[PDB]
Amino acid sequence: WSPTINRANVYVGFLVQLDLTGIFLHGKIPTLKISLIQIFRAHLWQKIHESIVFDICQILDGELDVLQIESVTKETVHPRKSYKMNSSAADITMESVHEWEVSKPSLLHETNDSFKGLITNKMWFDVQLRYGDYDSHDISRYVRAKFLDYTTDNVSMYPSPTGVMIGIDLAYNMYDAYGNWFNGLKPLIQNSMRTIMKANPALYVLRERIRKGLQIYQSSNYAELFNNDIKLFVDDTNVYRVTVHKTFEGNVATKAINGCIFTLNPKTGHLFLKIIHTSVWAGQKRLSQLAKWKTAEEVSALVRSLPKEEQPKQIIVTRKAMLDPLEVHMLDFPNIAIRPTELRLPFSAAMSIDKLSDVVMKATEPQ
Amino acid sequence: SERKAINKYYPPDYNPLEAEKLSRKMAKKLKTMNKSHASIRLMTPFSMRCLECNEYIPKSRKFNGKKELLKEKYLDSIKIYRLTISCPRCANSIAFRTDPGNSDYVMEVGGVRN
Amino acid sequence: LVDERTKQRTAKAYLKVSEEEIKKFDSRIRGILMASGSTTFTKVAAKWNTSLIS
Amino acid sequence: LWPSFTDEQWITIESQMRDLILTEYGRKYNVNISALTQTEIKDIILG
Amino acid sequence: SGDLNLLKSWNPKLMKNRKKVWETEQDLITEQQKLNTRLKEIEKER
Amino acid sequence: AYDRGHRIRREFKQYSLERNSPFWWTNSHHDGKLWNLNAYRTDVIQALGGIETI
RNA sequence: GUAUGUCUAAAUGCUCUUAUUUACUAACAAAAU
RNA sequence: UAAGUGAUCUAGAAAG
Ligand SMILES: [Mg+2]
């Protein structure tokens, strides 16, 4: 009952901002604070925000030339910017190739638009986290308010006057954005947001923590694999691969290489081999975790691609800790079960096969 | 200043991740935190005799012990601990282990249960 | 109140919880409240329910 | 991805592979002897 | 209050710890059973 | 059927025990549940908007 | 309510692990149908 | 032939 117990419509609560988070407490409420801290342990809020920003950047990179984008600069903000609720700053500044004809300040879910109002060469994305609560749980409205406030007054450390304020209510899992848009951007943005909500690592972690706090919950079998029902072995061992080597000076250069996602149908022998490229791992951290997420995403994509007749029943996973992400990604497909296994299956030796290895080597993109 | 303090003051430049990293760097050097036999307050469940001076420390008697991790766990993923005590009269290091197979303790070259 | 012979509702009988019972109830409530600085909210609630149900 | 053998040839190859697997295992874990073929199934599949 | 140890993690007589232990045993036990049966089968075959 | 003089015994329980039964007056085994409150439980949620609101 | 007391001369960067905690404190409070 | 007007307590911080 945190979102009623702590809430904005308080009589006299001295609104302290909780430590290293964006979670206002209207007065000292006892156990609540502790719980919040537990949830948002190890600078979780910041991680979430940064993660979101990173995702956005990635999305932008993916769709550069489609929306006429010169460069997508992630600004070097002050660490606490995630949890400075009073002020704000442009997280992802965005240079244009040609001159954008942006709309008036409007919401992310608006069917009717007009792209003949304002013009601009530069834009910005702001990601604003908030912990919701029963009174002000509406996210869209909040974001609008923020936009009205920040953009207008004196200077809100935005390089351009026009931009967008993405906002994710962490306590209600609602998201909405508001600001200025150019033709074809908005739907894409919406889609991206949806994707993030479905599966961002940080967000997932947060959710898990919340669940924990609440205490909420939802060899012999080898011959069963080869019945008439369709299945898919999925390996993630060779997704993030590295080669290490000393230079003449002495520096050990840990160079990431092109990896694979071995997805084998044991019935038909269809190896749906997604080749992960070295450009995915550029300027990243918490890398193994990221890789798992990527793998999950790929799997989801594959599933989507497959029609209802050709879709699997049991997606089998080789490793133990490839379950959760996959599950998260496969909430769209609840009919498809995700199966673990005691078998340390040898699909990590996909790179031992020659042709496959060669293919992996000779890839200049995600393929 | 008050035990239920919501927010501790941070300097105006406090990159939290960076700070953490710094701390880590200065944790190997650190005296405390980089050691074993971290303290604890515990009552004695066994009710036993101190082997040197025969001091009959009874059940539930409170002591400032040292809890240390035993590397050799029970089974696989359930830890067991050495819990050091001193006898009141003579300063002999009594201790015991918590082997959870029987839901009870084991004496460790300190005293004897009776 | 009914006459058994004719089956007529021949008399009325109005009820009121005697003051002693009320007092007892109050005491019970107090008891529930007192000696409950800890207790899991839920336990307290349960106790109250029990009292109230009685 | 693989060489196109005849059936007998394929069988032979499989046998060889099995032998290799066994031998390597022996080298590694210094096991005395494989008890049966059904015990080796576990080794093959699961690892 | 009385017995302090009851409010400690390390205390095995604490119920949570006991539960955890049981869970560990249960999983491990199950695994053993699974393997044990296999072993028996192998023996029979031999 | 052989437990006779049971109500009286229950009543007199007050003097034997520290915390007594608050349902001395009845006894489930000889009387059956004289009340049932699942309906109430069902309806409280409804009153509070339904589940979604909660 | 997170006790306390004595004791005191004047290698460098690197990264990788997490859906946790060798976690600690008990001064505080203690019941059923 | 005439119903249905109004009365609305509260409200957190420390130490123990
Ligand atoms: Mg006092």
mmCIF file with all atom_site columns, C-alpha atoms in Angstrom, chain A residues 54-204:
data_model
loop_
_atom_site.group_PDB
_atom_site.id
_atom_site.type_symbol
_atom_site.label_atom_id
_atom_site.label_alt_id
_atom_site.label_comp_id
_atom_site.label_asym_id
_atom_site.label_entity_id
_atom_site.label_seq_id
_atom_site.pdbx_PDB_ins_code
_atom_site.Cartn_x
_atom_site.Cartn_y
_atom_site.Cartn_z
_atom_site.occupancy
_atom_site.B_iso_or_equiv
_atom_site.pdbx_formal_charge
_atom_site.auth_seq_id
_atom_site.auth_comp_id
_atom_site.auth_asym_id
_atom_site.auth_atom_id
_atom_site.pdbx_PDB_model_num
ATOM 1   C CA . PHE A 1 54  ? 21.322 3.851  -23.605 1.00 0.00 ? 54  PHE A CA 1
ATOM 2   C CA . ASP A 1 55  ? 18.393 1.976  -25.133 1.00 0.00 ? 55  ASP A CA 1
ATOM 3   C CA . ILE A 1 56  ? 17.105 5.184  -26.702 1.00 0.00 ? 56  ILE A CA 1
ATOM 4   C CA . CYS A 1 57  ? 20.551 5.905  -28.139 1.00 0.00 ? 57  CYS A CA 1
ATOM 5   C CA . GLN A 1 58  ? 20.720 2.397  -29.591 1.00 0.00 ? 58  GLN A CA 1
ATOM 6   C CA . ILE A 1 59  ? 17.297 2.850  -31.173 1.00 0.00 ? 59  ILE A CA 1
ATOM 7   C CA . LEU A 1 60  ? 18.393 6.156  -32.692 1.00 0.00 ? 60  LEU A CA 1
ATOM 8   C CA . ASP A 1 61  ? 21.524 4.521  -34.097 1.00 0.00 ? 61  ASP A CA 1
ATOM 9   C CA . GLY A 1 62  ? 19.419 1.750  -35.621 1.00 0.00 ? 62  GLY A CA 1
ATOM 10  C CA . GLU A 1 63  ? 17.151 4.308  -37.352 1.00 0.00 ? 63  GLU A CA 1
ATOM 11  C CA . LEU A 1 64  ? 19.620 7.117  -38.240 1.00 0.00 ? 64  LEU A CA 1
ATOM 12  C CA . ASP A 1 65  ? 19.108 7.688  -41.986 1.00 0.00 ? 65  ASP A CA 1
ATOM 13  C CA . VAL A 1 66  ? 15.348 6.911  -41.858 1.00 0.00 ? 66  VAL A CA 1
ATOM 14  C CA . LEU A 1 67  ? 14.564 10.019 -39.752 1.00 0.00 ? 67  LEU A CA 1
ATOM 15  C CA . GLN A 1 68  ? 17.402 12.233 -41.128 1.00 0.00 ? 68  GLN A CA 1
ATOM 16  C CA . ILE A 1 69  ? 19.703 12.233 -38.081 1.00 0.00 ? 69  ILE A CA 1
ATOM 17  C CA . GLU A 1 70  ? 23.257 13.601 -38.365 1.00 0.00 ? 70  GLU A CA 1
ATOM 18  C CA . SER A 1 71  ? 24.454 12.545 -34.899 1.00 0.00 ? 71  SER A CA 1
ATOM 19  C CA . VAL A 1 72  ? 22.998 11.213 -31.637 1.00 0.00 ? 72  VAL A CA 1
ATOM 20  C CA . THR A 1 73  ? 25.025 12.665 -28.772 1.00 0.00 ? 73  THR A CA 1
ATOM 21  C CA . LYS A 1 74  ? 24.483 11.273 -25.277 1.00 0.00 ? 74  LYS A CA 1
ATOM 22  C CA . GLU A 1 75  ? 25.378 14.224 -23.020 1.00 0.00 ? 75  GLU A CA 1
ATOM 23  C CA . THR A 1 76  ? 27.766 13.838 -20.073 1.00 0.00 ? 76  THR A CA 1
ATOM 24  C CA . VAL A 1 77  ? 25.238 14.752 -17.361 1.00 0.00 ? 77  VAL A CA 1
ATOM 25  C CA . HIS A 1 78  ? 25.870 14.975 -13.615 1.00 0.00 ? 78  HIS A CA 1
ATOM 26  C CA . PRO A 1 79  ? 25.299 11.476 -12.023 1.00 0.00 ? 79  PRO A CA 1
ATOM 27  C CA . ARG A 1 80  ? 22.393 12.677 -9.843  1.00 0.00 ? 80  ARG A CA 1
ATOM 28  C CA . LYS A 1 81  ? 20.489 14.105 -12.866 1.00 0.00 ? 81  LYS A CA 1
ATOM 29  C CA . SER A 1 82  ? 18.388 10.934 -12.858 1.00 0.00 ? 82  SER A CA 1
ATOM 30  C CA . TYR A 1 83  ? 17.227 11.870 -9.350  1.00 0.00 ? 83  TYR A CA 1
ATOM 31  C CA . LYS A 1 84  ? 17.143 15.652 -9.501  1.00 0.00 ? 84  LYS A CA 1
ATOM 32  C CA . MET A 1 85  ? 13.388 16.160 -9.673  1.00 0.00 ? 85  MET A CA 1
ATOM 33  C CA . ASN A 1 86  ? 13.533 19.970 -9.349  1.00 0.00 ? 86  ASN A CA 1
ATOM 34  C CA . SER A 1 87  ? 15.742 20.664 -12.377 1.00 0.00 ? 87  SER A CA 1
ATOM 35  C CA . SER A 1 88  ? 16.486 18.634 -15.531 1.00 0.00 ? 88  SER A CA 1
ATOM 36  C CA . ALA A 1 89  ? 18.868 18.275 -18.511 1.00 0.00 ? 89  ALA A CA 1
ATOM 37  C CA . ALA A 1 90  ? 18.901 16.997 -22.102 1.00 0.00 ? 90  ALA A CA 1
ATOM 38  C CA . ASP A 1 91  ? 20.154 13.426 -22.004 1.00 0.00 ? 91  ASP A CA 1
ATOM 39  C CA . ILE A 1 92  ? 20.233 12.601 -25.707 1.00 0.00 ? 92  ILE A CA 1
ATOM 40  C CA . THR A 1 93  ? 20.900 15.619 -27.918 1.00 0.00 ? 93  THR A CA 1
ATOM 41  C CA . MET A 1 94  ? 20.113 14.971 -31.534 1.00 0.00 ? 94  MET A CA 1
ATOM 42  C CA . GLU A 1 95  ? 21.580 16.764 -34.570 1.00 0.00 ? 95  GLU A CA 1
ATOM 43  C CA . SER A 1 96  ? 19.661 16.856 -37.876 1.00 0.00 ? 96  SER A CA 1
ATOM 44  C CA . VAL A 1 97  ? 20.997 16.492 -41.435 1.00 0.00 ? 97  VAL A CA 1
ATOM 45  C CA . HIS A 1 98  ? 18.265 18.642 -43.018 1.00 0.00 ? 98  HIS A CA 1
ATOM 46  C CA . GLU A 1 99  ? 15.930 21.047 -41.173 1.00 0.00 ? 99  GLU A CA 1
ATOM 47  C CA . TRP A 1 100 ? 13.166 19.283 -39.165 1.00 0.00 ? 100 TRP A CA 1
ATOM 48  C CA . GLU A 1 101 ? 9.635  20.715 -39.286 1.00 0.00 ? 101 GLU A CA 1
ATOM 49  C CA . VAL A 1 102 ? 8.531  19.758 -35.748 1.00 0.00 ? 102 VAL A CA 1
ATOM 50  C CA . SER A 1 103 ? 5.019  19.741 -34.290 1.00 0.00 ? 103 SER A CA 1
ATOM 51  C CA . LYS A 1 104 ? 3.806  21.760 -31.296 1.00 0.00 ? 104 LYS A CA 1
ATOM 52  C CA . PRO A 1 105 ? 4.323  20.321 -27.776 1.00 0.00 ? 105 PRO A CA 1
ATOM 53  C CA . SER A 1 106 ? 2.144  17.193 -27.842 1.00 0.00 ? 106 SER A CA 1
ATOM 54  C CA . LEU A 1 107 ? 1.768  13.711 -26.319 1.00 0.00 ? 107 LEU A CA 1
ATOM 55  C CA . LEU A 1 108 ? 3.245  10.387 -27.422 1.00 0.00 ? 108 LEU A CA 1
ATOM 56  C CA . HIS A 1 109 ? -0.180 8.809  -28.083 1.00 0.00 ? 109 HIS A CA 1
ATOM 57  C CA . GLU A 1 110 ? -1.772 11.371 -30.410 1.00 0.00 ? 110 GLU A CA 1
ATOM 58  C CA . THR A 1 111 ? -3.237 10.277 -33.771 1.00 0.00 ? 111 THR A CA 1
ATOM 59  C CA . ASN A 1 112 ? -3.737 13.875 -35.014 1.00 0.00 ? 112 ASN A CA 1
ATOM 60  C CA . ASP A 1 113 ? -0.608 15.978 -35.712 1.00 0.00 ? 113 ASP A CA 1
ATOM 61  C CA . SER A 1 114 ? 0.558  19.009 -37.716 1.00 0.00 ? 114 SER A CA 1
ATOM 62  C CA . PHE A 1 115 ? 4.200  19.311 -38.862 1.00 0.00 ? 115 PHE A CA 1
ATOM 63  C CA . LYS A 1 116 ? 4.095  22.938 -40.130 1.00 0.00 ? 116 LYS A CA 1
ATOM 64  C CA . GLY A 1 117 ? 4.496  24.855 -36.833 1.00 0.00 ? 117 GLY A CA 1
ATOM 65  C CA . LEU A 1 118 ? 8.065  25.122 -35.545 1.00 0.00 ? 118 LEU A CA 1
ATOM 66  C CA . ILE A 1 119 ? 11.337 24.315 -37.326 1.00 0.00 ? 119 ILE A CA 1
ATOM 67  C CA . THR A 1 120 ? 14.635 23.040 -35.883 1.00 0.00 ? 120 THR A CA 1
ATOM 68  C CA . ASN A 1 121 ? 18.115 21.661 -36.641 1.00 0.00 ? 121 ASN A CA 1
ATOM 69  C CA . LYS A 1 122 ? 18.802 20.244 -33.146 1.00 0.00 ? 122 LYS A CA 1
ATOM 70  C CA . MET A 1 123 ? 16.641 18.255 -30.711 1.00 0.00 ? 123 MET A CA 1
ATOM 71  C CA . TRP A 1 124 ? 16.857 16.590 -27.297 1.00 0.00 ? 124 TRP A CA 1
ATOM 72  C CA . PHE A 1 125 ? 15.456 13.642 -25.384 1.00 0.00 ? 125 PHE A CA 1
ATOM 73  C CA . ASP A 1 126 ? 15.027 13.848 -21.633 1.00 0.00 ? 126 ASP A CA 1
ATOM 74  C CA . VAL A 1 127 ? 14.282 10.716 -19.671 1.00 0.00 ? 127 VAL A CA 1
ATOM 75  C CA . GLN A 1 128 ? 12.431 11.533 -16.435 1.00 0.00 ? 128 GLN A CA 1
ATOM 76  C CA . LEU A 1 129 ? 11.882 8.780  -13.928 1.00 0.00 ? 129 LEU A CA 1
ATOM 77  C CA . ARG A 1 130 ? 9.232  9.122  -11.255 1.00 0.00 ? 130 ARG A CA 1
ATOM 78  C CA . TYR A 1 131 ? 7.892  6.984  -8.474  1.00 0.00 ? 131 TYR A CA 1
ATOM 79  C CA . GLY A 1 132 ? 4.122  7.195  -8.780  1.00 0.00 ? 132 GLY A CA 1
ATOM 80  C CA . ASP A 1 133 ? 1.471  7.313  -6.107  1.00 0.00 ? 133 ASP A CA 1
ATOM 81  C CA . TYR A 1 134 ? -2.319 7.119  -5.946  1.00 0.00 ? 134 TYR A CA 1
ATOM 82  C CA . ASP A 1 135 ? -2.922 10.861 -6.278  1.00 0.00 ? 135 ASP A CA 1
ATOM 83  C CA . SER A 1 136 ? -0.463 11.725 -9.065  1.00 0.00 ? 136 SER A CA 1
ATOM 84  C CA . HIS A 1 137 ? -0.124 8.268  -10.690 1.00 0.00 ? 137 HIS A CA 1
ATOM 85  C CA . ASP A 1 138 ? -1.087 9.768  -14.091 1.00 0.00 ? 138 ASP A CA 1
ATOM 86  C CA . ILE A 1 139 ? 2.245  9.875  -15.901 1.00 0.00 ? 139 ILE A CA 1
ATOM 87  C CA . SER A 1 140 ? 1.322  11.638 -19.135 1.00 0.00 ? 140 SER A CA 1
ATOM 88  C CA . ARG A 1 141 ? -0.073 14.663 -17.311 1.00 0.00 ? 141 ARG A CA 1
ATOM 89  C CA . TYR A 1 142 ? 3.027  14.844 -15.127 1.00 0.00 ? 142 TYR A CA 1
ATOM 90  C CA . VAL A 1 143 ? 5.293  14.760 -18.167 1.00 0.00 ? 143 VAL A CA 1
ATOM 91  C CA . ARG A 1 144 ? 3.256  17.509 -19.828 1.00 0.00 ? 144 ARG A CA 1
ATOM 92  C CA . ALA A 1 145 ? 3.556  19.634 -16.698 1.00 0.00 ? 145 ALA A CA 1
ATOM 93  C CA . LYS A 1 146 ? 7.308  19.079 -16.617 1.00 0.00 ? 146 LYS A CA 1
ATOM 94  C CA . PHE A 1 147 ? 7.589  20.094 -20.264 1.00 0.00 ? 147 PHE A CA 1
ATOM 95  C CA . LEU A 1 148 ? 5.581  23.247 -19.595 1.00 0.00 ? 148 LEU A CA 1
ATOM 96  C CA . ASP A 1 149 ? 7.848  24.107 -16.669 1.00 0.00 ? 149 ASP A CA 1
ATOM 97  C CA . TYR A 1 150 ? 11.334 23.111 -17.835 1.00 0.00 ? 150 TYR A CA 1
ATOM 98  C CA . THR A 1 151 ? 11.337 24.204 -21.470 1.00 0.00 ? 151 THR A CA 1
ATOM 99  C CA . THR A 1 152 ? 9.984  27.702 -20.779 1.00 0.00 ? 152 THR A CA 1
ATOM 100 C CA . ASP A 1 153 ? 11.802 29.149 -17.763 1.00 0.00 ? 153 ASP A CA 1
ATOM 101 C CA . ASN A 1 154 ? 15.163 30.960 -18.185 1.00 0.00 ? 154 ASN A CA 1
ATOM 102 C CA . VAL A 1 155 ? 17.305 27.955 -19.370 1.00 0.00 ? 155 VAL A CA 1
ATOM 103 C CA . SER A 1 156 ? 16.754 24.250 -18.496 1.00 0.00 ? 156 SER A CA 1
ATOM 104 C CA . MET A 1 157 ? 20.160 23.128 -19.826 1.00 0.00 ? 157 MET A CA 1
ATOM 105 C CA . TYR A 1 158 ? 18.724 22.151 -23.225 1.00 0.00 ? 158 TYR A CA 1
ATOM 106 C CA . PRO A 1 159 ? 20.753 23.141 -26.296 1.00 0.00 ? 159 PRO A CA 1
ATOM 107 C CA . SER A 1 160 ? 17.629 23.363 -28.497 1.00 0.00 ? 160 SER A CA 1
ATOM 108 C CA . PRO A 1 161 ? 14.284 24.865 -27.412 1.00 0.00 ? 161 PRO A CA 1
ATOM 109 C CA . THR A 1 162 ? 12.485 21.881 -28.984 1.00 0.00 ? 162 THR A CA 1
ATOM 110 C CA . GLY A 1 163 ? 12.657 18.330 -27.682 1.00 0.00 ? 163 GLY A CA 1
ATOM 111 C CA . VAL A 1 164 ? 10.881 15.458 -25.960 1.00 0.00 ? 164 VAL A CA 1
ATOM 112 C CA . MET A 1 165 ? 10.472 14.390 -22.343 1.00 0.00 ? 165 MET A CA 1
ATOM 113 C CA . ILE A 1 166 ? 10.138 10.637 -22.041 1.00 0.00 ? 166 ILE A CA 1
ATOM 114 C CA . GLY A 1 167 ? 8.748  9.659  -18.623 1.00 0.00 ? 167 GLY A CA 1
ATOM 115 C CA . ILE A 1 168 ? 8.410  6.275  -16.943 1.00 0.00 ? 168 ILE A CA 1
ATOM 116 C CA . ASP A 1 169 ? 6.386  5.875  -13.766 1.00 0.00 ? 169 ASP A CA 1
ATOM 117 C CA . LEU A 1 170 ? 8.415  3.170  -12.031 1.00 0.00 ? 170 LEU A CA 1
ATOM 118 C CA . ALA A 1 171 ? 5.760  2.430  -9.394  1.00 0.00 ? 171 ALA A CA 1
ATOM 119 C CA . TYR A 1 172 ? 2.872  2.031  -11.867 1.00 0.00 ? 172 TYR A CA 1
ATOM 120 C CA . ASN A 1 173 ? 4.917  0.899  -14.919 1.00 0.00 ? 173 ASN A CA 1
ATOM 121 C CA . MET A 1 174 ? 3.141  3.556  -17.014 1.00 0.00 ? 174 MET A CA 1
ATOM 122 C CA . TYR A 1 175 ? 5.157  5.460  -19.579 1.00 0.00 ? 175 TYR A CA 1
ATOM 123 C CA . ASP A 1 176 ? 4.496  8.536  -21.622 1.00 0.00 ? 176 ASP A CA 1
ATOM 124 C CA . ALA A 1 177 ? 6.345  11.228 -23.457 1.00 0.00 ? 177 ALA A CA 1
ATOM 125 C CA . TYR A 1 178 ? 5.551  14.720 -24.574 1.00 0.00 ? 178 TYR A CA 1
ATOM 126 C CA . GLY A 1 179 ? 7.163  17.391 -26.690 1.00 0.00 ? 179 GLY A CA 1
ATOM 127 C CA . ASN A 1 180 ? 8.008  18.019 -30.324 1.00 0.00 ? 180 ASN A CA 1
ATOM 128 C CA . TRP A 1 181 ? 8.006  15.473 -33.142 1.00 0.00 ? 181 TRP A CA 1
ATOM 129 C CA . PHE A 1 182 ? 8.856  15.157 -36.853 1.00 0.00 ? 182 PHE A CA 1
ATOM 130 C CA . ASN A 1 183 ? 7.135  12.977 -39.452 1.00 0.00 ? 183 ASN A CA 1
ATOM 131 C CA . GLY A 1 184 ? 7.476  9.205  -38.894 1.00 0.00 ? 184 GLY A CA 1
ATOM 132 C CA . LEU A 1 185 ? 9.296  9.593  -35.552 1.00 0.00 ? 185 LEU A CA 1
ATOM 133 C CA . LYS A 1 186 ? 6.482  9.248  -33.089 1.00 0.00 ? 186 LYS A CA 1
ATOM 134 C CA . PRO A 1 187 ? 5.215  5.749  -33.865 1.00 0.00 ? 187 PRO A CA 1
ATOM 135 C CA . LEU A 1 188 ? 8.778  4.427  -33.847 1.00 0.00 ? 188 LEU A CA 1
ATOM 136 C CA . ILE A 1 189 ? 9.428  6.145  -30.523 1.00 0.00 ? 189 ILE A CA 1
ATOM 137 C CA . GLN A 1 190 ? 6.263  4.625  -29.071 1.00 0.00 ? 190 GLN A CA 1
ATOM 138 C CA . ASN A 1 191 ? 7.328  1.180  -30.251 1.00 0.00 ? 191 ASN A CA 1
ATOM 139 C CA . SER A 1 192 ? 10.757 1.645  -28.683 1.00 0.00 ? 192 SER A CA 1
ATOM 140 C CA . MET A 1 193 ? 9.172  2.696  -25.397 1.00 0.00 ? 193 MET A CA 1
ATOM 141 C CA . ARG A 1 194 ? 6.926  -0.366 -25.453 1.00 0.00 ? 194 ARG A CA 1
ATOM 142 C CA . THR A 1 195 ? 9.934  -2.601 -26.084 1.00 0.00 ? 195 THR A CA 1
ATOM 143 C CA . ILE A 1 196 ? 11.795 -1.000 -23.185 1.00 0.00 ? 196 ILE A CA 1
ATOM 144 C CA . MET A 1 197 ? 8.832  -1.535 -20.880 1.00 0.00 ? 197 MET A CA 1
ATOM 145 C CA . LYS A 1 198 ? 8.552  -5.176 -21.943 1.00 0.00 ? 198 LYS A CA 1
ATOM 146 C CA . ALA A 1 199 ? 12.261 -5.735 -21.404 1.00 0.00 ? 199 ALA A CA 1
ATOM 147 C CA . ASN A 1 200 ? 14.890 -3.321 -20.164 1.00 0.00 ? 200 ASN A CA 1
ATOM 148 C CA . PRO A 1 201 ? 17.343 -5.075 -17.856 1.00 0.00 ? 201 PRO A CA 1
ATOM 149 C CA . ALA A 1 202 ? 17.277 -2.409 -15.158 1.00 0.00 ? 202 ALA A CA 1
ATOM 150 C CA . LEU A 1 203 ? 13.482 -2.222 -15.200 1.00 0.00 ? 203 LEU A CA 1
ATOM 151 C CA . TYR A 1 204 ? 13.255 -6.008 -14.951 1.00 0.00 ? 204 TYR A CA 1
#
